[PDB]
């Protein structure tokens, strides 16, 4: 692994959230347990299935400057996807990825 984003901090809600050329998803893990709800090859693997041009990534809990200064991840995880910094969904726990993507399949 060397591509992709991940873990960055700043970066992210720098100029790729807000940036991104296409439409990525933003998985939580929310700080509840150290070795918590992490990240999973799951995601990404099905992020870029449905295509392969969409992207995806896991936040970066070395303290995480960025949502945790605007978002606020202090735990609940949850999942949003953005593809120019506007927001495009989100589904907290209970069914998040599952019921947004239900409801279409992925992104769109």
């Known amino acids: 692994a060397v591509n992709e984003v991940?873990?960055?901090?700043?970066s992210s809600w720098d100029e790729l959230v807000i940036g991104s050329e296409t439409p990525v998803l933003v998985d939580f893990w929310a700080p509840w347990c150290g070795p918590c709800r992490m990240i999973?090859?799951?995601?990404?693997?099905?992020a870029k299935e449905y295509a392969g041009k969409i992207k995806?990534?896991?936040?970066?809990?070395?303290?995480?400057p960025n949502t945790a200064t605007k978002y606020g991840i202090r735990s609940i995880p949850t999942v949003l996807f953005f593809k120019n910094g506007e927001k495009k969904?989100?589904?907290?726990?209970?069914?998040?990825?599952?019921?947004?993507?239900?409801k279409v399949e992925k992104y769109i």
Not at 90 to 96: D, F, H, K, L, N
């Open 6 to 10: 991940q873990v960055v901090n700043d």
């Open 89 to 102: 969904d989100s589904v907290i726990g209970a069914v998040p990825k599952a019921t947004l993507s239900e």
């Open 40 to 46: 999973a090859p799951i995601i990404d693997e099905l």
């Open 56 to 64: 995806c990534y896991k936040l970066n809990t070395d303290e995480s």
